Amino acid sequence: KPIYFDYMATTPVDPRVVEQMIKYLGPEGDFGNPASATHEYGRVASMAVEQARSQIAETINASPQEIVFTSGATEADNLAILGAARFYKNKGMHLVTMSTEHKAVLDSFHQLEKEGFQVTYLNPESDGLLDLEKLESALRLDTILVSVMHVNNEIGVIQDIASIGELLRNRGIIFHVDAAQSAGKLPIDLSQLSVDLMSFSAHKNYGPKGVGALYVRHKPRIRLQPLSYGGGHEGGLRSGTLPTHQIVGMGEAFAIAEADRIPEQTRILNLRKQLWDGIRHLPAIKLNGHEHRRIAGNLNVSFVGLNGDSLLFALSELAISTSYVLRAIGLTDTEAQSTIRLSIGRFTSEVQIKKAIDIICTQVSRLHELS
Amino acid sequence: KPIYFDYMATTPVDPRVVEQMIKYLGPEGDFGNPASATHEYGRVASMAVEQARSQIAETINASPQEIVFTSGATEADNLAILGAARFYKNKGMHLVTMSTEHKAVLDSFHQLEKEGFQVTYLNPESDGLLDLEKLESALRLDTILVSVMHVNNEIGVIQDIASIGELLRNRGIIFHVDAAQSAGKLPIDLSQLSVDLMSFSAHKNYGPKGVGALYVRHKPRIRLQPLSYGGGHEGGLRSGTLPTHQIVGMGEAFAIAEADRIPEQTRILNLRKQLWDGIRHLPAIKLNGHEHRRIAGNLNVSFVGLNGDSLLFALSELAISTSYVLRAIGLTDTEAQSTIRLSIGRFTSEVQIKKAIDIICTQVSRLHELS
Incomplete structure (x- = not known):
């Protein structure tokens, strides 16, 4: 090889994470549906889901209720960007992001352009860093949302999400951060960072593919117009089944990475x-x-x-x-x-x-x- | 217990399915990203994804290219119903379903009602069976889509999707079937059944939670307006990462169930x-x-x-x-x-x-x- x-x-799933995931698969394990409230198979699986929600929340200093599970950072990016823009469009329809964002972010903005949103795609400097003066000059009285990734997936550069968030908070502009490439690697303290929405991917952080999360700030409250319909429901924001083994795997991966x-x-x-x-x-x-x-x-x-x-x-x-x-x-x-x-x-x-x-x-x- | x-x-994941899934998790296994075209870790993972796509397709007598992987039958139901209705709305905006459908179907139609679609929710008879004469009487010249589940999740009743599909095909109406509770249990032969869209859930059929598929008929071609944005991309219909272990698990579960x-x-x-x-x-x-x-x-x-x-x-x-x-x-x-x-x-x-x-x-x- x-x-x-x-x-x-x-990334490979960490073997310590694999050992936990497999307890939630076969008939000898805790395979119940977390939404099955009427027996202990369901209740045990729910407890494992909620423990993983707490593990993730603890690593980023958020509360568990602020964590919405998704099928990956792609869904989290979609839900954050489409959901916030569509919910707050009566406040303004101008949006700002960078040309270097992952396609899950850029293609979300591309869709919003078909819905009438005006989007400014800022280029970085030649070292990949956003010139924050260029960001400030791009902001308008009708800008409602900005999305800037923490770590670029191609060239690895780190944006100053701390300054960005503070600057946008002062203007009442929602700040989304794609953190798929930074969680488990860079410090993330959402009790200090003025970030309103933040996307996470388990398999960039030694968890399994096919699971992620969206942080949704509770105070000041951020609302989203959801993209899915059905059961659940993650506070009404994400419908569907909670896949215990996937979520357990994500929670354990996040806990292991943050501890070291x-x-x-x-x-x-x-x-x-x-x-x-x-x-x-x-x-x-x-x-x-x-x-x-x-x-x-x-x-x-x-x-x-x-x-x-x-x-x-x-x-x-x-x-x-x-x-x-x-x-x-x-x-x-x-x-x-x-x-x-x-x-x-x-x-x-x-x-x-x-x-x-x-x-x-x-x-x-x-x-x-x-x- | x-x-x-x-x-x-x-359902529990069948232990035979677990044994295959775990080959695609840790560092000793085939953990590559199926979308990584530039090395053998990616290529091996893609081959396992495509083999699972073939396994599923073979069980329902579809072609692999007609299989779109999702995070579950909830996403498949959403994508089928919102995607078809939104794509074909210039042809008509009347839709028909049953009051007994799973919430992933009903809540999709509820959303389309906010978008101006007119929806008829037909009640079954007291044995749970749809009166197909009542279905026929509900059809209009501007009906574009009907969704009727194969097996009801609460009372287990089977609808006559064969007759329904033929009746709708003759009228040029798209037929979606939620098959979450029938795949692996009832015969499904899409070379004979006039079904245009069909939803599948792995964990109702001894596969892992958090993975499903949408069958999208290729001839006559069915198009969908997608609900996700990013990479992939399942023929442009579903963006995001292909989770090898989940997809492998679904394919193996479908193959095992259909063989016996x-x-x-x-x-x-x-x-x-x-x-x-x-x-x-x-x-x-x-x-x-x-x-x-x-x-x-x-x-x-x-x-x-x-x-x-x-x-x-x-x-x-x-x-x-x-x-x-x-x-x-x-x-x-x-x-x-x-x-x-x-x-x-x-x-x-x-x-x-x-x-x-x-x-x-x-x-x-x-x-x-x-x-």
Whole structure:
């Protein structure tokens, strides 16, 4: 098997999380429907759901009642953005986001444009950071919602959601943050951060795919127009069945990551710096995105002059990712296609880092030699 | 533990299904993101997703491309009903369903009423069966969509989706069927059935909670206006991440159930008949819903004169379910609250059936004696 260096696409479920999830699957376990109020199979499953809701809430310093379970950060992004814009449209129909947002955010705004909303898509600077003066200049008296992601999924850059939130709160503008790539890695304290809506994905944080959550601030109260209809119902905001094993898995993953967050992230940073220092003397290599205001595990690099398909093949002993985010920060088409995303995580070893350096040094050297 | 008699609320994941799901979770397994096209972790996970899509398609005689994965039959119902009505509204805005549909269907129609759609909610007859003459009389030249569930979740009655579909096809009306309670139990052959949209839930069929599918007929082509935005994308109809373990679990559950469907369902029918024959001489007991045009595992009975809370407590050695469906078939408030739903399934034994008869006979007798 190639060495996995694509943690930002998905992570393995932590084995400690697997051990908890499997208690909620088969006939020997707690398989009841959390909505079955009339027997102990249902009640036990509900208790496990609510314990996971508390685990997640504790990691971000929110209350459990502010946590709405979803099928992933895609649904959370959709529900936050469509739900808030549609609920508050009588207050104004101008919206602001960044051109570097994940498609689950951009495509939500694209839909709202068909509904008459006016959307401003701000570009970052060339290091991927939003110029907050450009944000301020874009705000209008009829701006009702802004969405800015905490960590970019391609280039790993961190936006200053603390300042953004405070600036928007003073204007009465709702602030949504896509935190899919930051939860379990960066501090999130919603008792201090002026964030109104925040999206979470379990499988970016060593939980199972197919489950996420939306934080919905209770004070000042944020309301949403829901996107689903049926049973449940997560305070009326999300209808459907509560999948006990998925939710248990998400709660346990969040608890595990937060309990060791700073040591784990600094160990990962050390490995990422080691990787970068091992490859950064290769000819025409460029690091994309701010080097330090950046999640520990992300290394996004362009090998100017080389072909992306050729890089993927030559580097096939590494499992890596090989365009609109790169264009937004100023790369040409040609530069963007020479770019790879390496991402490191909980199961990356020092031995694998040294092998990656050797593979990248050897193979990029050959591609330059064979150029 | 009480004996589980609430299979229609949820089923345990079959242990054979668990064994497959767990191969797609932790770091030792195939945890890659199916959308990661640039390495073998992604490609292996995609292959498992597509194999599960084929498994499901084969059980209902559809093509894989007609299968859209969802987070459950709730999302599938929402996507079918809102998506078809909103896509075809220029053709007409009249819709027809039954008052006995699951809330994921009724609440979708409730939302469309806020969007200007006119909805006719037909009541069944007192045995729960739709009078198809009443359906025909309700159809209009501007009716674009009808939704009728295959198996009712409360009283287990089976609607004649074959005749309904043919009647609607002749009128150019889209037919949606909620099959959450019938897949894996009743025959479904979409090469013969004139059904345009059909919803599926894994956890009603011994798969994991939190995953389902929507069948979308390819010929004549059915289009839908999607409810989600982002990546993927299931032919543009459902955005988000494909959760490999969930989808694998659903595909394996569907394959297992269909391979032994008629023997398993007839064994369950024998047990359900045994249960009913053991309790049906109790005073004032009434069976709700047609006795034979009914899924094998459902027994919905009213103990006229007794209190539902008292029944739940007295019968606590059994895990059972204890209102608008019962009102629709003609029960009074008082009769409806005296009603329990017992549902039998794959792990119900003959020994448990005999114990249920003894418990129900003993405890209902006492409740009548202590009345």
